[PDB]
Amino acid sequence: AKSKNHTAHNQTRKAHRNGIKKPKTYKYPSLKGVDPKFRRNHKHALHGTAKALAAAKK
Amino acid sequence: GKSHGYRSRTRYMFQRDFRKHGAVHLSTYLKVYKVGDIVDIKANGSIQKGMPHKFYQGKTGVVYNVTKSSVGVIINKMVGNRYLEKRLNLRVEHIKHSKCRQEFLERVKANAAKRAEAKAQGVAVQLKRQPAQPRESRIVSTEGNVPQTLAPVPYETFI
Amino acid sequence: KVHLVAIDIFTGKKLEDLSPSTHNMEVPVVKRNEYQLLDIDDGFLSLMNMDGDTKDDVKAPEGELGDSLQTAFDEGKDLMVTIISAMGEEAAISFKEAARTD
Amino acid sequence: QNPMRDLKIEKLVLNISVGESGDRLTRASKVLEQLSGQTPVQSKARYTVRTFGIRRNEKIAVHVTVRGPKAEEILERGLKVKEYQLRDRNFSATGNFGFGIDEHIDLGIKYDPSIGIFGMDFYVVMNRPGARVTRRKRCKGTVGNSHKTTKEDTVSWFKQKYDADVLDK
Amino acid sequence: QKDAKSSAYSSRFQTPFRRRREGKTDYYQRKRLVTQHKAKYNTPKYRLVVRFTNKDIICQIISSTITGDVVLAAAYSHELPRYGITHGLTNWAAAYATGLLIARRTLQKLGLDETYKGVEEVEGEYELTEAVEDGPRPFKVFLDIGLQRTTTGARVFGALKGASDGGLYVPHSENRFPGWDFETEEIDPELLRSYIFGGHVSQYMEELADDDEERFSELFKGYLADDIDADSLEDIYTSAHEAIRADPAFKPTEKKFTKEQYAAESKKYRQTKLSKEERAARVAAKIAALAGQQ
RNA sequence: GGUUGCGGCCAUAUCUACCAGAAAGCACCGUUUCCCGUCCGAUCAACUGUAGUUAAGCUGGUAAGAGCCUGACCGAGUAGUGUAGUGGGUGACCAUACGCGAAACUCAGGUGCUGCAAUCU
RNA sequence: GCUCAUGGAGAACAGAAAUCUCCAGUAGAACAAAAGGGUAAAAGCCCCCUUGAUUUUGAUUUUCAGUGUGAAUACAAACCA
RNA sequence: CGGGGUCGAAAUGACCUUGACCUAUUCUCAAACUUUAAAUAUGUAAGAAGUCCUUGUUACUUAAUUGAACGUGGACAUUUGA
RNA sequence: AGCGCCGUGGCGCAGUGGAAGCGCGCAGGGCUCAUAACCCUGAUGUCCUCGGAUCGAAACCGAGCGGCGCUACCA
To answer: Where in the sequence is Phosphoserine found (chain C)?
Structure first.
């Protein structure tokens, strides 16, 4: 007793109800997936600049 | 059986081109890529490493990461009812820039030039683009340009 | 369901079974191999390959085939003998004369 | 005009296509190197057939490629055994040519019963300079049809040399 | 008949690139050499190109852009005579000298020469221009020989050693400088120094001088004119190395003329294209001659 | 402007048949002791730049040239296609309205440009 | 380092097909297989040396619930060719 | 140059015919052929999380106080970028 | 109609990618007054046809042709 195998009917109505929200883009994104060499240097550089700005205004 | 592979229904898509088989030219490699760069994606089937999926063929994305011979790209992808962020470690043979973004940057610096000139004279820049507005009146003459009366043509079989 | 009748081959013994047409039944990986013939000691067939003078092998199948082959070797005319390797239970099955390469 | 399009030889080559492999082929190689003073180069099959009784990569033949004064010396010895008489049928469509013969010992060889007898195929490649303009690695090029060589000029050269005639066709 | 290709063949034909039609490049190699780690975004990839004609040597420092390769330096056997060589402007020693010269030229224009002096006392050994401590790293350069056969005992590698002695960080290995015994993997620095200062050439000179004076006169004819010998050649090579380290600063010619004078004569002598109207005239004359029925 | 080297775009650059080529530069070319590779100093390595030739390569010009490229107020607003219609028709199909719009063909034109450096009467 | 299929023109035995030599040869071959893409100083043929078919665990893509499995991609720290 | 028919002794000698192959021409085609190539559908950008100038940081990168990433300070408004 | 098997000498039947086996039949010789049987000898197989892959097929995979077989139940 065969059946209805497949259909995409009504799926787009379902989606566009409350649908296709763009992903919330953020400042300062993930540094995962990024070259770890660059991650490491970026860490040390930020440590340096934080120290420098605090020493400029201590 | 049903066959759904990484390189399925891709024949004419990764068909290289006509009279452009063989290797790749060198600006593909001498070009530069930085974080925040927007890039197009067409795939070179002659380079079977670092390829994208056929979904990402002919698409557009942003860079997040850079390595020896490859580049990170972010894409948004419809999955059901949302756009998902998808990260690709692609090769520059498949990358190229977005001239739309290039022209946008040029428009930006020109807008800045206009703001500078209007700081110099206070002369009402009107920076924004505006559409092809509807056109204004005019007077067309007739000299050497008389109207030729036209009319339809009868039915000829033309065999 | 299938009635199957097959002869066990190293013995010559009939084997009748029956089982449904869709159930799995086992098969070995049998292969025959030709081998040359050398001076026959006691029952070990004195054979060899193109790259080996090996085969202190299957010990002389006692059949009329074995006896007729013994006589053919008594009158020479080297006989490329064929064997089979079903389940590592080797045995000689037939032979043919070197019509060339005398 | 003729500054340096004057003609010369590029190479002689000697081929021997033994029907099978074995000591006969080794002996043929011995013969060729005995003549040349330099070692020859063997030749393997291309595919398989029983009419000759052969297989793929079965060492059916041998040959050599030699040059220069030695090459032309061997050549004129071939010519004197060939009574300095040859064929336009033998000459090629380019000026290159050759001839296949028997009884190599005719070339003045101290025969040995071991080596036996072997027939041969001499072939001759003439040219003008620009050989490396085609046969080098850099700035490669296809020569001009003017500087090319042909059957007619080659046979004229070969006849006025030695005053040695050939057949009609 | 056979000397006529097809319209379809010539249509579907894909050209190679221009330099490949001309037989001058391997874009394989060019890619491998100029392509760069994209973390090093704009920092170029500096090739030391070397090339060998008949009667000349070229050594250049070259970079790569999108419009064309771009140059810093140059060096030429046909200007070595400033530094004191007259003959053998394509030999192993002249190659070494050119490499040394371009090295010192670059380090001159960039100030890396006082630091990374290079080498003056030469013996023929393998050692690279290892960096200074607490200072700028030496100039990293990569060899480009185009198509020439990497093979043991070549003037290209002679030039390479010249650069490395001149003070350039070129990466290499000692397994192709001549004297590199294959089975006993050791180089012979004394033989190498002999080839630097003209060992093999002096050996040829010596043997010809003892036996074959007719060839010693036929060639080395300039050496006959100049009264040269098997110590003078070493001494001039050494003094020329010193002069190279002294004043490598590329004094060019005077050119005797101007660009547009050269061009005036060349354009005068030049050919030119037969325009459309006179093409029509040409075919019409062909018609009136032959289609005019004689 | 010419030439050489490294080149970008990779046929307006290719292919074929011929014609010419000041200088310089390339190239052809001469040689085998030396490192080196070859059946072979032909290829490749090395030496001289001497012996000689611009014939070939190379550069350019010609061809109612093949090919390639561009454009058309050539074909063609055709074919196809989006949307609308209680439009027509038995139906296949079609026309109309608001819109987009090919390719082939036909004809005309063009036949490499150009960057860095060095060099040539 | 070489350039394939095929065709043409030659070379005794040798012929349609044996080996050698010249010209053209944009791929009409070959790449373990199915088919499809891709590839011409190569990814094909030959030659030389090797064992990165290695270790650490993570990230990513595809199928997808953004679970697994399988396969692949790009990196970091090592050891190697 | 496949088959042959003829002249004749035959002759890569001569002639005739016939399937091949070559040449350019012609008629018709392709969901699993294609140079070309739409319409419709589809991705991305249209700024403040931005642009410019200056100089701080780093064990990253550079031959290099060169570049990269993130920042200080300042400027760029009303049309803050269809 | 669907599915499966098989096509080998004149006949029958074997045959496993490097290349066809046997018997009976056939032919020749000899013995015999002649034919049989008998003894000595030899030969014969487009491996159903086309195509393919393979360096190469009877075999291995498609096309067709044929001789057969098996299926055919619940109504």
So the answer is: 19
Please count the other Cβ atoms lying within 10 Å of the Cβ belonging to residue D37: 8
Q: Mind telling me how many Å the CA of B24 is from chain A's nearest CA?
A: 27
| CB-CB neighbours of A3 under 10 Å | 4
Question: Which chain D residue shows the shortest CA-CA distance from E22?
Answer: D139
Cα dihedral: B77, B80, B83, B89 (round 10): -30
Distance between CA atoms of residues E59 and E48, nearest Å? 7
DSSP strand E in chain C: where?
Answer: 2-8, 13-19, 32-37, 47-48, 79-86, 89-97
| Resolution of the experimental structure, in angstroms | 3.1
Q: Which residue is nearest to nucleotide I21 (CA to C1')?
A: C96
Taking the C-alpha atoms of residue D55 and residue D48, their distance in angstroms, rounded to an integer, is 4
B75: β partners: B86
All chains having 3 or more CB pairs closer than 8 angstroms to chain C: none
* B77 inside 8 A of chain A by CB: no
- Which of strand I's nucleotides are less than 7 A from any protein C-beta? 16, 18-21, 55-56
Query: What is the spatial distance, in angstroms and rounded to an integer, between the CA atom of D126 and the C1' atom of F18?
Result: 25
Between CA D64 and CA A13 the distance in angstroms is 81
How many C-alpha atoms does B68 have within 13 Å on its Cβ side? 2
Query: Tokens 């002695």 sit at which residue?
Result: E165
Q: Do B67 and E35 touch (CB under 8 A)?
A: no
D47-79 exposure pattern, b = at least 16 Cβ within 10 A, e = fewer: eeeeeeebeeebbbbbbbbbeeeebbebeeebb
Nearest CB to B65 within list A18, A23, A35: A35
Phi then psi for residue E229, to 5 deg, are -155, 180
Best residue in A11, A16, A18, A20 for a mutation probing chain B (most B CBs within 10 Å)? A20
C85 touches strand I (CB under 7 A): no
Residue C2: φ, ψ to 5°:
-115, 130
Cβ contact, residue pair B65, A33, below 8 Å: yes
Q: Which residue of D has its CA nearest to E3?
A: D145
- Angstroms from E146 CA to nearest CA on chain D: 9
Cα dihedral C39, C41, C45, C51 in deg (nearest 10): -50
Q: Which residues pair with B39 in a beta bridge?
A: B61, B97
Residue type, E44: P
Distance CA E247, CA E228 (A): 25
Q: Which long-range contacts (CB under 8 A, 24 or more apart) does D97-104 make?
A: D97/D123, D97/D124, D97/D154, D97/D158, D98/D122, D98/D123, D98/D124, D104/D31, D104/D35
> Is C80 near strand I, with its CB below 7 A from some atom of it?
no
Tokens of E83: 């530094």
CA distances from residue E128 to E139, E162, E179 in whole angstroms, order as listed: 12, 11, 18
Angle between helices E189-196 and E155-166 (to 10 degrees): 100
